[PDB]
Amino acid sequence: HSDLTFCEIILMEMESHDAAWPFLEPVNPRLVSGYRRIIKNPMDFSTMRERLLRGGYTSSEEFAADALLVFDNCQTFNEDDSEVGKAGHIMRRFFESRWEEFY
Ligand SMILES: CCC(=O)c1c[nH]c(C(=O)OC)c1
């Protein structure tokens, strides 16, 4: 559980990141046309936060799966040169970097 301690570390670092603004809260399908249709399994940092505090992560691979899901959804719905897309690539590279330099 140096595992789940690190998950707390990297989640907090992601939550406080400059490019984290599109992923702090769940996407509002009422405000974003087509998101409900295109993204099957929505995921964000607050949802990951809620599950983490309540100990809902069996292990670190489950945590990583949700994090990558956030960035997979981002690249699926948003253009790479869009403001959200650009922020997503920064966050995705940040996660993979910090995650790997530990594991
Ligand atoms: C219309 C705004 C929009 O397309 C959008 C807002 N948030 C996202 C998103 O995918 O953030 C995760 C897309």
Q: Taking the domains of the chain in order of start, what are their residue ranges?
A: 1-103
What is the CA(83)–ligand 1 centre distance, in A?
A: 9
**Is 1.20.920.10 the CATH classification of the domain at 1-103?**
yes
| Residues 2, 48, 34: CA angle, nearest 5 degrees | 150
* Residue 44, H or E segment: none
Give the residue, out of 84, 86, 92, with the most ligand 1 atoms within 8 A of its beta carbon, to mutate for a pocket test: 84
Neighbouring residues of 59: CB distance < 8 A, sequence distance ≥ 6: 3, 4
Resolution in A: 2.3
State the Cα–Cα distance between residues 9 and 92, nearest whole angstrom: 16
Task: Name the structure determination technique.
Answer: X-ray
Provide the b/e sequence for 48-76 (b: ≥16 CB within 10 Å).
Answer: bbeebeeeebeebeebbebbebbbbbbee
At 68 the three-state DSSP class reads: helix
